[PDB]
GROMACS .gro file of C-alpha atoms in nm:
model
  444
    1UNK     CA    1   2.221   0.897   1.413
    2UNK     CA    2   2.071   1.204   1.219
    3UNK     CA    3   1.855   1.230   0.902
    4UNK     CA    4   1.825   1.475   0.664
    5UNK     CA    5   1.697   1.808   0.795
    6UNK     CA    6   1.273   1.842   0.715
    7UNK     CA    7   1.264   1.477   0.729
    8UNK     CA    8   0.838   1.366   0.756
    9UNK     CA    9   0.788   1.131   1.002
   10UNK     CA   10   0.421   0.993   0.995
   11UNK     CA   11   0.230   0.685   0.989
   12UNK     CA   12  -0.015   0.550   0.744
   13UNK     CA   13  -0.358   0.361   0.722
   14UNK     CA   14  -0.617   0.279   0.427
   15UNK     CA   15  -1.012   0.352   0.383
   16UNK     CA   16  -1.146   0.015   0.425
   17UNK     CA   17  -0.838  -0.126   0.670
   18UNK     CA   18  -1.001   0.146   0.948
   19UNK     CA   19  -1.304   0.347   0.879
   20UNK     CA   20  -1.588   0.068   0.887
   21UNK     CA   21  -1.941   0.215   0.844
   22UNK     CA   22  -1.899   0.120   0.427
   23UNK     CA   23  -2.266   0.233   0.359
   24UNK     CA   24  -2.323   0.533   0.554
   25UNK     CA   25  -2.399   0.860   0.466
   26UNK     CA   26  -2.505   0.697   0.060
   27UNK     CA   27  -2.172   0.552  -0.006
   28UNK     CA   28  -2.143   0.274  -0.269
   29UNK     CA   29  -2.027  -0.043  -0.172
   30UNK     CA   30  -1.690  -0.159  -0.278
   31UNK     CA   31  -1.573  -0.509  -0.422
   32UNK     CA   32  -1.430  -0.576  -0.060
   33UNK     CA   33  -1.750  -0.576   0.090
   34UNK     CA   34  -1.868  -0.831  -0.186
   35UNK     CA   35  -1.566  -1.012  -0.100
   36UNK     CA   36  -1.551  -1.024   0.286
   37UNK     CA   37  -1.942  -1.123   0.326
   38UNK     CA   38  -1.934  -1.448   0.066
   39UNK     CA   39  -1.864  -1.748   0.332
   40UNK     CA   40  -1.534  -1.941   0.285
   41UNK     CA   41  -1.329  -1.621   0.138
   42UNK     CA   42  -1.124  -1.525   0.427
   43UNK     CA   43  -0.978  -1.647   0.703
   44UNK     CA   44  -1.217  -1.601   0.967
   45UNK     CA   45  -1.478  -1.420   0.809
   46UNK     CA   46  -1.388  -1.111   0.965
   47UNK     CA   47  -1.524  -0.786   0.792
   48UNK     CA   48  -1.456  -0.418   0.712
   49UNK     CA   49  -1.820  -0.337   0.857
   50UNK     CA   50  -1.670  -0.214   1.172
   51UNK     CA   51  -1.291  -0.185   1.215
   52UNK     CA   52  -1.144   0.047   1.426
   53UNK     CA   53  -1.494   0.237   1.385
   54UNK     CA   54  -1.216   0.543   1.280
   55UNK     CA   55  -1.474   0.639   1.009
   56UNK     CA   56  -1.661   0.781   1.390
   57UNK     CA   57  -1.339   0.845   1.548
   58UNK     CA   58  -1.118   1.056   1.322
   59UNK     CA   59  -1.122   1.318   1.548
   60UNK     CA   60  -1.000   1.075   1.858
   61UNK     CA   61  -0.752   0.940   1.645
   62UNK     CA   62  -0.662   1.272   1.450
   63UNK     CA   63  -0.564   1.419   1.842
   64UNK     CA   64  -0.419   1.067   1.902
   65UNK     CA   65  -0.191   1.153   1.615
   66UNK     CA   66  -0.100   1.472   1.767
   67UNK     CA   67   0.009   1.312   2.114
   68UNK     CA   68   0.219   1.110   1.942
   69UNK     CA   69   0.412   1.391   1.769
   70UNK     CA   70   0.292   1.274   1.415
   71UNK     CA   71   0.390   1.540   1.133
   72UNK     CA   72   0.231   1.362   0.828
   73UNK     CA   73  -0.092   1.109   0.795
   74UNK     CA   74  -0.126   0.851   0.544
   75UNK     CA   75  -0.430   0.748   0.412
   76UNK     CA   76  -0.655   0.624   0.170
   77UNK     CA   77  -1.002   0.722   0.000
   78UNK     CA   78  -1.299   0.516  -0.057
   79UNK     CA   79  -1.400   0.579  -0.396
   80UNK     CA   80  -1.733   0.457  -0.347
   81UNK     CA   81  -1.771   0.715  -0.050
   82UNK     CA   82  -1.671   0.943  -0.377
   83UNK     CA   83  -1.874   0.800  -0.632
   84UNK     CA   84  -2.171   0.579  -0.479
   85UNK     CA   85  -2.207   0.418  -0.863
   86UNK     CA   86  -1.828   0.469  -0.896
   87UNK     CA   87  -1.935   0.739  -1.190
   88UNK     CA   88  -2.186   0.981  -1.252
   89UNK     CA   89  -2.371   1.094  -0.954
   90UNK     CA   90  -2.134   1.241  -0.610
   91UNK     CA   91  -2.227   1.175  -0.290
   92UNK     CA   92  -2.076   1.485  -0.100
   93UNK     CA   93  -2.163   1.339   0.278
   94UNK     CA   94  -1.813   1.087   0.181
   95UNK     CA   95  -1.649   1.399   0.045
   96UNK     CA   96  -1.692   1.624   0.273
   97UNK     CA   97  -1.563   1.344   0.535
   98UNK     CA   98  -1.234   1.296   0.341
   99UNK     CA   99  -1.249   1.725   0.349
  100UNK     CA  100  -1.301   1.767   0.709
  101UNK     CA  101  -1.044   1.457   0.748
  102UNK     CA  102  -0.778   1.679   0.588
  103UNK     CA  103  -0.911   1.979   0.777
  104UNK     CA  104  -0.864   1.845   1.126
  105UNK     CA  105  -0.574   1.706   1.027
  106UNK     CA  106  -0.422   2.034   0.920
  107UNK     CA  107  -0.496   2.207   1.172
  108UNK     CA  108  -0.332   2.013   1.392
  109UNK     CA  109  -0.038   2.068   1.197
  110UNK     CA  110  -0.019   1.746   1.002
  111UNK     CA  111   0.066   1.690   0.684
  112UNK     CA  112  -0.203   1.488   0.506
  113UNK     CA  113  -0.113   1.198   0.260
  114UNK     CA  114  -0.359   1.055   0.027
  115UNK     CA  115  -0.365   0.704  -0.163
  116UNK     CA  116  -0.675   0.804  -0.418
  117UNK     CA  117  -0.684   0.396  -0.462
  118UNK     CA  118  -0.619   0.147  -0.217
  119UNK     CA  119  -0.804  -0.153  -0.314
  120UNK     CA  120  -1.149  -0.054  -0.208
  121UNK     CA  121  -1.291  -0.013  -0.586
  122UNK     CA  122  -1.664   0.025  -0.583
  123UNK     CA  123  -1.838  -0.291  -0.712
  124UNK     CA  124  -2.083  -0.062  -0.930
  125UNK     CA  125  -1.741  -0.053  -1.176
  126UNK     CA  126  -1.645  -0.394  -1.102
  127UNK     CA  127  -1.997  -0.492  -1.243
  128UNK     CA  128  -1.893  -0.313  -1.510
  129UNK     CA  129  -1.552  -0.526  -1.602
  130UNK     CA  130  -1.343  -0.340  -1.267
  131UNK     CA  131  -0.982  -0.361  -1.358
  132UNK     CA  132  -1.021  -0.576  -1.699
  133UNK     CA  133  -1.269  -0.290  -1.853
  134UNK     CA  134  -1.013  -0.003  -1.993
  135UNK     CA  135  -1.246   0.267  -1.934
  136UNK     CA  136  -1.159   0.246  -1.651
  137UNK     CA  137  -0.841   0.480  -1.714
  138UNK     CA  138  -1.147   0.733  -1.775
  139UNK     CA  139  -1.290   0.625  -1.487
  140UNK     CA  140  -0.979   0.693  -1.260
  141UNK     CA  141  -0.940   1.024  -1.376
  142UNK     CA  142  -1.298   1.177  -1.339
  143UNK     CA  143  -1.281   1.013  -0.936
  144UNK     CA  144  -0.903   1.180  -0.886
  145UNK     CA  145  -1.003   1.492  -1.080
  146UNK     CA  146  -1.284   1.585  -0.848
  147UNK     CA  147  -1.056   1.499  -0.536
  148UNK     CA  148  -0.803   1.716  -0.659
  149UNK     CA  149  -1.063   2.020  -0.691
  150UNK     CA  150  -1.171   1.926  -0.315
  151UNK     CA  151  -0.823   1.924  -0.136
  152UNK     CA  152  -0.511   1.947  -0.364
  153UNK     CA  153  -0.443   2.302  -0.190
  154UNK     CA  154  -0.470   2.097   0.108
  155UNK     CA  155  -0.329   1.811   0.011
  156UNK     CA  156   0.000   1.819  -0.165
  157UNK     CA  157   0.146   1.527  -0.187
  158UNK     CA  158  -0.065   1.224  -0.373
  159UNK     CA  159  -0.024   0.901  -0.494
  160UNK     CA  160  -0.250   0.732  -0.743
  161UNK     CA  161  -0.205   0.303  -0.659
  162UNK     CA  162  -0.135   0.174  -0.344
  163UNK     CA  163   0.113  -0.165  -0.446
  164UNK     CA  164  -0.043  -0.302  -0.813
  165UNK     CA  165   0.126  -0.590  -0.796
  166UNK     CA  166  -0.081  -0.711  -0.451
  167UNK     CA  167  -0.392  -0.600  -0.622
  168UNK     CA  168  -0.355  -0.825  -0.921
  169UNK     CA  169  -0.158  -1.083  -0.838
  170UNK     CA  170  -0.393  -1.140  -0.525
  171UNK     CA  171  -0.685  -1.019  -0.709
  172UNK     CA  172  -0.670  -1.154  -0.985
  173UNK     CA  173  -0.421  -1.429  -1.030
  174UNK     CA  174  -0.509  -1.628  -0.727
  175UNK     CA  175  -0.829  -1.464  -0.609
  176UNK     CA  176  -0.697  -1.432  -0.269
  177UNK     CA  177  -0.790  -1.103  -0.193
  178UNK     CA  178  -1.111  -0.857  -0.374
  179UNK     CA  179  -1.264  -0.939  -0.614
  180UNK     CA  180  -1.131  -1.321  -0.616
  181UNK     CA  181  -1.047  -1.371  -0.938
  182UNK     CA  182  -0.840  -1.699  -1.056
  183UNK     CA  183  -0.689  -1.616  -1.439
  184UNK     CA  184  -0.408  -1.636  -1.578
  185UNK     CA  185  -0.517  -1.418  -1.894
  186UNK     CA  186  -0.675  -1.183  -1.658
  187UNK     CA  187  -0.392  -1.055  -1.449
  188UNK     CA  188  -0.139  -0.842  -1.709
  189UNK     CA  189  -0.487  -0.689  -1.816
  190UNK     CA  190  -0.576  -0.566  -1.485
  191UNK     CA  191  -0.201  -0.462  -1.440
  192UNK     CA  192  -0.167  -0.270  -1.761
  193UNK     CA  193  -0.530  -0.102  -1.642
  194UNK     CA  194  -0.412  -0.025  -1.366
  195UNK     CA  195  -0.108   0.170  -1.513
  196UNK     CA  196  -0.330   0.352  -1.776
  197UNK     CA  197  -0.582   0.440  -1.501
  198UNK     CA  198  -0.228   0.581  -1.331
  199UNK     CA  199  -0.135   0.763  -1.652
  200UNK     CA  200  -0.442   0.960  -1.718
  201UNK     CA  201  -0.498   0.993  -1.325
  202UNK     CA  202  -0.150   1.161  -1.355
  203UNK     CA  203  -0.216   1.400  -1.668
  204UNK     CA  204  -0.527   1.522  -1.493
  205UNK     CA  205  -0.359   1.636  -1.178
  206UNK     CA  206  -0.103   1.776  -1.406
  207UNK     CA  207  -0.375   2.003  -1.578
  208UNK     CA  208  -0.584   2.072  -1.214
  209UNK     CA  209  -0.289   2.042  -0.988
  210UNK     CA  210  -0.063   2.274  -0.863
  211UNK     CA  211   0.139   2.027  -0.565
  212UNK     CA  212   0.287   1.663  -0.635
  213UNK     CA  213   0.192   1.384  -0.753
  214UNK     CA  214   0.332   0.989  -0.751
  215UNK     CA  215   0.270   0.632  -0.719
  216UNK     CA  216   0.319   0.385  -0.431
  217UNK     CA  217   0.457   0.025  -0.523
  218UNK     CA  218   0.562  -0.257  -0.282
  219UNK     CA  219   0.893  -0.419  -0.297
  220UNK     CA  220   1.067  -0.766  -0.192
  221UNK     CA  221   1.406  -0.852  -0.292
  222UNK     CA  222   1.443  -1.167  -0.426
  223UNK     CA  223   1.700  -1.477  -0.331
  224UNK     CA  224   1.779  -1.782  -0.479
  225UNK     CA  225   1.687  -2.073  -0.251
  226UNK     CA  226   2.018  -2.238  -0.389
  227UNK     CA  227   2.289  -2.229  -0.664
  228UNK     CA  228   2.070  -2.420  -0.874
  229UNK     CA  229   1.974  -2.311  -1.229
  230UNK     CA  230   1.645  -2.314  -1.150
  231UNK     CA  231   1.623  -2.151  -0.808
  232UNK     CA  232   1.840  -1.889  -0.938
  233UNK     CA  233   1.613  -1.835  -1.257
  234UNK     CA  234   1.250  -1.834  -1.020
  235UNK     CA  235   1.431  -1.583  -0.793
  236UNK     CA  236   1.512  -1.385  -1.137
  237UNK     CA  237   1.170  -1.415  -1.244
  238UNK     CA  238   0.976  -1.345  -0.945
  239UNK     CA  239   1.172  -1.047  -0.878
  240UNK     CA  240   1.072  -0.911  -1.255
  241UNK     CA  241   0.734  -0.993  -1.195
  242UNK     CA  242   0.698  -0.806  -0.852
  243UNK     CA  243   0.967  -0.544  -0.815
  244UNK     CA  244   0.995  -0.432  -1.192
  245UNK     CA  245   0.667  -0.509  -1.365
  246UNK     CA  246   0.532  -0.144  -1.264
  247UNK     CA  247   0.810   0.066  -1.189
  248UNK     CA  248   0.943   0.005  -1.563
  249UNK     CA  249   0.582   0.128  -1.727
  250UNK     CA  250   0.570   0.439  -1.487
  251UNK     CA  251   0.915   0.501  -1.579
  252UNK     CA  252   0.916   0.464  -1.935
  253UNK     CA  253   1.094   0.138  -1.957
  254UNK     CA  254   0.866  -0.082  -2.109
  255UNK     CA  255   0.761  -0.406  -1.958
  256UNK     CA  256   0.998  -0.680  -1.820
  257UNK     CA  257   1.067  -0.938  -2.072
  258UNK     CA  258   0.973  -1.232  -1.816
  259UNK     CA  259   0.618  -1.090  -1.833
  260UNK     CA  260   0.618  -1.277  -2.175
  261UNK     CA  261   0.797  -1.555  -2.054
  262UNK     CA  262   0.605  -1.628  -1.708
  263UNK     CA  263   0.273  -1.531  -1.909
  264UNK     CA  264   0.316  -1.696  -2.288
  265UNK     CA  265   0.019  -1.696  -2.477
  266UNK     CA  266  -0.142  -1.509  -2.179
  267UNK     CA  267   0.045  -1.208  -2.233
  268UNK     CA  268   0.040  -0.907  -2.513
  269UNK     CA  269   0.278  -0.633  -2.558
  270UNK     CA  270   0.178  -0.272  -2.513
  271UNK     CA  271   0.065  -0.057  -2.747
  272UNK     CA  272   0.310   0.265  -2.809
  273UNK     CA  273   0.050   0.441  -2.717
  274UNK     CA  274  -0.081   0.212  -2.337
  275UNK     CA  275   0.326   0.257  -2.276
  276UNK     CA  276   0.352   0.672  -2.322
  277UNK     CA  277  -0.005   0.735  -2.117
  278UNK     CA  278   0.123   0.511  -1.825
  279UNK     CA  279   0.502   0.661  -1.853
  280UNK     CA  280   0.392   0.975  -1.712
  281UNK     CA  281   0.661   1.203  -1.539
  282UNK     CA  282   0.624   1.216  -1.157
  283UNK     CA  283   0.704   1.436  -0.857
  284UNK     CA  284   0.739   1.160  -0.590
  285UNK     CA  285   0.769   0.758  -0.575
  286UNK     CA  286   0.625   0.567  -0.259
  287UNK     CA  287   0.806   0.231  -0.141
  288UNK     CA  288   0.631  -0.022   0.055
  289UNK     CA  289   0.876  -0.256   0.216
  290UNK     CA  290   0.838  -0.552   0.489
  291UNK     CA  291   1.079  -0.821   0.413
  292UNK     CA  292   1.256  -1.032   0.144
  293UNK     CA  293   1.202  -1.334  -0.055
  294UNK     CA  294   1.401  -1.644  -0.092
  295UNK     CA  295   1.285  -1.763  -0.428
  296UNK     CA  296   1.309  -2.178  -0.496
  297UNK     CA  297   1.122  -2.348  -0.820
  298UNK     CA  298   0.825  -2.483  -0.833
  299UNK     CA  299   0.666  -2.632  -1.101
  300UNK     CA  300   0.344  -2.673  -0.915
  301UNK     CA  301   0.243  -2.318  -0.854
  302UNK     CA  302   0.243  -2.197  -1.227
  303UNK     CA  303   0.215  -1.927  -1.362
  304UNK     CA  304   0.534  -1.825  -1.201
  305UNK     CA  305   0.685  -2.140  -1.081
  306UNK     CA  306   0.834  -2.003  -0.771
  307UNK     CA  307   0.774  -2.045  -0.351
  308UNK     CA  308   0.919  -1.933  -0.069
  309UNK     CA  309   1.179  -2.118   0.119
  310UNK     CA  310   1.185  -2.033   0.528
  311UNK     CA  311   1.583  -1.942   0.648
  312UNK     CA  312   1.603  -2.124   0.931
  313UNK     CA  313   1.761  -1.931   1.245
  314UNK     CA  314   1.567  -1.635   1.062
  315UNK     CA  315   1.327  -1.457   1.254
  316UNK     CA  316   0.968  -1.428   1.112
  317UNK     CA  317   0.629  -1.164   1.169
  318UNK     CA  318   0.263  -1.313   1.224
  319UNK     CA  319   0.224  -1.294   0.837
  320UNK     CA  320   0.558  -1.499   0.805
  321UNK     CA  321   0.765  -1.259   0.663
  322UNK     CA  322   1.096  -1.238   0.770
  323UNK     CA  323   1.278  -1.006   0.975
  324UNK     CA  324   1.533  -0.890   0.692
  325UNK     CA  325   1.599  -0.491   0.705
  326UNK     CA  326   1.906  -0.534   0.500
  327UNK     CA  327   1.662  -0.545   0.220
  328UNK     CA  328   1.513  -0.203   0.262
  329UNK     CA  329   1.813  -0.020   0.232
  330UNK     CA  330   1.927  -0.239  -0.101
  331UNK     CA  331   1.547  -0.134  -0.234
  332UNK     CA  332   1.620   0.254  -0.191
  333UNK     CA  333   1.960   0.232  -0.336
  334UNK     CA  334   1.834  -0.006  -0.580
  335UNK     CA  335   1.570   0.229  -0.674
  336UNK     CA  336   1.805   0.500  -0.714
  337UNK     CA  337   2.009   0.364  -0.980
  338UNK     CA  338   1.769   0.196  -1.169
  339UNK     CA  339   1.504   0.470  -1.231
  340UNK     CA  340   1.657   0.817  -1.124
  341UNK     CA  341   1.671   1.107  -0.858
  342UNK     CA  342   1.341   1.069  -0.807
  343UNK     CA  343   1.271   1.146  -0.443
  344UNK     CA  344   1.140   0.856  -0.262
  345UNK     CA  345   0.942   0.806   0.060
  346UNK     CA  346   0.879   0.499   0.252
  347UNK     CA  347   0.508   0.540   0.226
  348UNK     CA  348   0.424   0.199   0.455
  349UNK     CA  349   0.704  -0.018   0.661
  350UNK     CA  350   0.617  -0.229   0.989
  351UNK     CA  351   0.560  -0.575   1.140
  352UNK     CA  352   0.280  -0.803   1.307
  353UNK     CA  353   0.386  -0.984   1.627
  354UNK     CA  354   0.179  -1.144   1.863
  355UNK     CA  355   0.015  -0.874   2.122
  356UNK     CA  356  -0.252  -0.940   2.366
  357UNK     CA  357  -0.629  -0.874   2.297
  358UNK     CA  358  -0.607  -0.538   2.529
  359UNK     CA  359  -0.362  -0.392   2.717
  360UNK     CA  360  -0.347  -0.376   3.091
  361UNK     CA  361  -0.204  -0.050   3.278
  362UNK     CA  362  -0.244   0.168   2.993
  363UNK     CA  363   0.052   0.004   2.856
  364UNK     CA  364   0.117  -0.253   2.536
  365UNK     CA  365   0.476  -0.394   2.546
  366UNK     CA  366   0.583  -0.526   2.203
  367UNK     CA  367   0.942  -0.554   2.233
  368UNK     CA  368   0.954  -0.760   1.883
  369UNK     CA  369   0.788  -0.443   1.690
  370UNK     CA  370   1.038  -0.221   1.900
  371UNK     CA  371   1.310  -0.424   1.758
  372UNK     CA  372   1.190  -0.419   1.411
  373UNK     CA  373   1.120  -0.052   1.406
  374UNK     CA  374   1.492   0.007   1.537
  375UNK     CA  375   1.646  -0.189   1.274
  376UNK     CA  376   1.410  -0.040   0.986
  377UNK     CA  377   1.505   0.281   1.050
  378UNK     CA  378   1.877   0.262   1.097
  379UNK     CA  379   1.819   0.073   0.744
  380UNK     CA  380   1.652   0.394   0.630
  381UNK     CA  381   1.946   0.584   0.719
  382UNK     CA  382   2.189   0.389   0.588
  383UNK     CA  383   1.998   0.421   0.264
  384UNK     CA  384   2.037   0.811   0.270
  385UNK     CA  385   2.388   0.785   0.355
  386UNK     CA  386   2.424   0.604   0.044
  387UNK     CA  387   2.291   0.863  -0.165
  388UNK     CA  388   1.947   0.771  -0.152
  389UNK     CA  389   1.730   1.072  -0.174
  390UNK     CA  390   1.461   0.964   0.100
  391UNK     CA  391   1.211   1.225   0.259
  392UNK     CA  392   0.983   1.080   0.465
  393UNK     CA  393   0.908   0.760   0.668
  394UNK     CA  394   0.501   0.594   0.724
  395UNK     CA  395   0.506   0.325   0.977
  396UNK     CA  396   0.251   0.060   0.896
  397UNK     CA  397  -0.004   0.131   1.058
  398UNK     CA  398  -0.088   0.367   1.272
  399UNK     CA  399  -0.374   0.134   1.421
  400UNK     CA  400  -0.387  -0.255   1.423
  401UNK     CA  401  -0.662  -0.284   1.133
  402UNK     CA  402  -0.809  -0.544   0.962
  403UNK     CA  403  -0.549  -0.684   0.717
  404UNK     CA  404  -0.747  -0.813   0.431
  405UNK     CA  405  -0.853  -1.136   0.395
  406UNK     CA  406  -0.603  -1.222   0.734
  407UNK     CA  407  -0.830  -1.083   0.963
  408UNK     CA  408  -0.798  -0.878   1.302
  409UNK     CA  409  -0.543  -1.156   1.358
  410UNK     CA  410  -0.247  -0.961   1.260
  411UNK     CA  411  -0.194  -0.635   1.402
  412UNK     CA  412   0.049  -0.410   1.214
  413UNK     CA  413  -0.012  -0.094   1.477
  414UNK     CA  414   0.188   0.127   1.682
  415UNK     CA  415  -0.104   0.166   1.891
  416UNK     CA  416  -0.300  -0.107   1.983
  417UNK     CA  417  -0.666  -0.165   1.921
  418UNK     CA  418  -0.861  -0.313   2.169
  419UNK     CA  419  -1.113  -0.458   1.914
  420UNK     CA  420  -1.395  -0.504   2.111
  421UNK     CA  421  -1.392  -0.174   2.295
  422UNK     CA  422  -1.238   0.006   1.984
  423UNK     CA  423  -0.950   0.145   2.270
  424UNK     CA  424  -0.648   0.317   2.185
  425UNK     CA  425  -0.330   0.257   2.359
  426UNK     CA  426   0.022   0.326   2.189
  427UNK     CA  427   0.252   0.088   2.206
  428UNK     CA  428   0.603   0.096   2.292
  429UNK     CA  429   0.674   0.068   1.942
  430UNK     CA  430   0.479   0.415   1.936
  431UNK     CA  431   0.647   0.589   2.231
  432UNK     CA  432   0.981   0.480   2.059
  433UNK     CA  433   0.896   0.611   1.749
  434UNK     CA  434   0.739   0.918   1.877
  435UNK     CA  435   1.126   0.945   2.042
  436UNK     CA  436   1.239   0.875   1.714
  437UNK     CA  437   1.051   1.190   1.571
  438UNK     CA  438   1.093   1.433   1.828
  439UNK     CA  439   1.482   1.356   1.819
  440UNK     CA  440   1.468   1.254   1.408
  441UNK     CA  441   1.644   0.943   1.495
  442UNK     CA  442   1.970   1.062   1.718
  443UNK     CA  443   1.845   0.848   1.957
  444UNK     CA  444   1.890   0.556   1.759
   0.00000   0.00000   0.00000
């Protein structure tokens, strides 16, 4: 019916997912570009080289924003637009792209959102160890540090990681996304780094910045497949691995005990002091949400030992994740209790179904995403009636995009892309939630 009063409504996109052009203007490549042009590493050998060409277009898309009513932009920045050799020398073409970015979107009067990382790391650093190398804390800092003295007037509300648990586990467990590594050993290294890159990234703003500051994680509540000891158990453990194994570190709570036990002789404890750089205190916390996971054993897919069961009668997305929104508002309550009063946005929520390669009319009906949206945000509000503190909403995406190592495939966007023509057209999902704004959800 009504949500709290200031409430942001926006949507949200990432550097490499939409800008394309990854070399122009001196920019360092990144690990994805590596990744996406070595045959046989994604599904159709789709690339980043183009996308929705938005790295041309912001403008287009910046006033597409404001026809839609957006108040707040999410998005990401390349570092290696930043930092062509990821250190050292700075490029300023990239940074005064991601400066003008802000500026046009300002003056439009949105509110820009910035993911510093977002899974584009340049490959100069990952030819220097990437994530496993713990420099790279140092590393983190000196990229956010000079991003803050661009824009963090301008900008004002950050977050340093965009969902560490995708990055390693497909990363660097099963090497199904950038940089394709396949290590057991490897992965709770590149996840503490990743935390200790947060950390310092954190304690620099804090001595630069004068706005807020948080992190973004991704979230999937976890069910056992069935009563059995060991369905219940995997659902147990993938749910420490994935909801808790970042949020506790951030938060001062140490790491889950199931890291050791998932991990065993691949896994260390902290140091004192890895735990009190990464537990640094935060303004804001960012919660990625799409669906839920039914959790049954399997003693094939080790480390973790755990697969996902399909409900039948449930309904499911183009990346087979099911319709659940149930889920959402458990993860802000959840949230809530566990770590605090923190307040919380729902940095990236959304849903892939099956839409035609260009629309016809003007018009792309997507009655499914409609759907999905609706129940999503009543979710959302439910949530704050609980007590849940939440302050803004950013549909994923604002654009169907490339989707990683999925391709063009699966479209996530409010407005669809018309890939070959780069065209916009909103949706209905967007003229719905462009309702939804203008109204702030009474006409749910």
């Amino acid at each position: 019916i009504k949500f709290p009063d200031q409430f942001l409504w926006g949507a949200a996109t990432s550097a490499y997912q939409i800008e394309g052009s990854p070399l122009a203007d001196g920019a360092g490549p990144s690990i994805w570009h590596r990744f996406v042009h070595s045959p046989g590493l994604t599904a159709k050998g789709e690339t980043g080289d183009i996308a929705c060409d938005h790295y041309n277009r912001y403008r287009d898309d910046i006033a597409l924003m404001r026809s839609l009513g957006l108040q707040a932009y999410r998005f990401s920045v390349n570092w290696g637009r930043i930092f062509p050799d990821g250190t050292g020398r700075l490029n300023s073409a990239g940074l005064d792209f991601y400066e003008r970015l802000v500026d046009a979107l300002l003056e439009a009067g949105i509110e820009p959102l910035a993911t510093l990382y977002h899974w584009d790391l340049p490959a100069a650093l990952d030819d220097r160890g990437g994530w496993l190398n713990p420099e790279i804390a140092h590393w983190f800092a000196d990229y956010a540090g000079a991003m803050f003295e661009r824009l963090d007037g301008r900008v004002k509300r950050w977050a340093t990681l965009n969902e560490p648990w995708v990055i390693t586990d497909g990363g660097y467990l099963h090497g199904a996304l950038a940089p394709g590594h396949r290590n057991v050993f490897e992965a709770p290294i590149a996840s503490r780094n990743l935390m200790l890159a947060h950390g310092a990234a954190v304690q620099r703003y804090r001595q630069a910045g004068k706005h807020e500051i948080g992190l973004v994680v991704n979230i999937e509540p976890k069910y056992p497949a069935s009563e059995s000891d060991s369905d219940r158990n995997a659902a147990a453990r993938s749910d420490a691995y994935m909801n808790r194994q970042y949020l506790d570190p951030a938060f001062g709570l140490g790491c889950p005990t199931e890291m050791a036990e998932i991990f065993g002789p691949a896994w260390r404890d902290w140091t004192a002091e890895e735990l009190a750089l990464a537990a640094q205190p935060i303004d804001w916390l960012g919660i990625n949400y799409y669906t839920r996971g039914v959790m049954k054993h399997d003693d094939a897919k080790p480390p973790v030992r755990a697969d996902y069961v399909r409900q039948p009668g449930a309904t499911y997305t183009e990346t087979g994740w099911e319709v659940f929104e149930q889920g959402l508002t458990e993860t802000l309550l959840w949230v809530k209790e566990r770590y605090g009063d923190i307040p919380l946005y729902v940095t990236e929520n959304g849903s892939a179904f099956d839409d035609p390669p260009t629309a016809q009319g003007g018009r792309l009906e997507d009655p499914a995403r409609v759907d999905y949206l609706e129940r999503h945000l009543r979710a959302v509000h439910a949530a704050i009636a609980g007590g849940a503190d939440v302050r803004g909403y950013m549909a994923w995406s604002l654009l169907d995009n490339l989707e990683w190592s999925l391709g063009f495939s699966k479209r996530f966007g409010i407005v669809h892309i018309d890939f070959e023509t780069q065209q916009r057209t909103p949706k209905d999902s967007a003229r719905l939630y462009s309702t939804v704004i203008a109204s702030n959800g009474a006409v749910l």
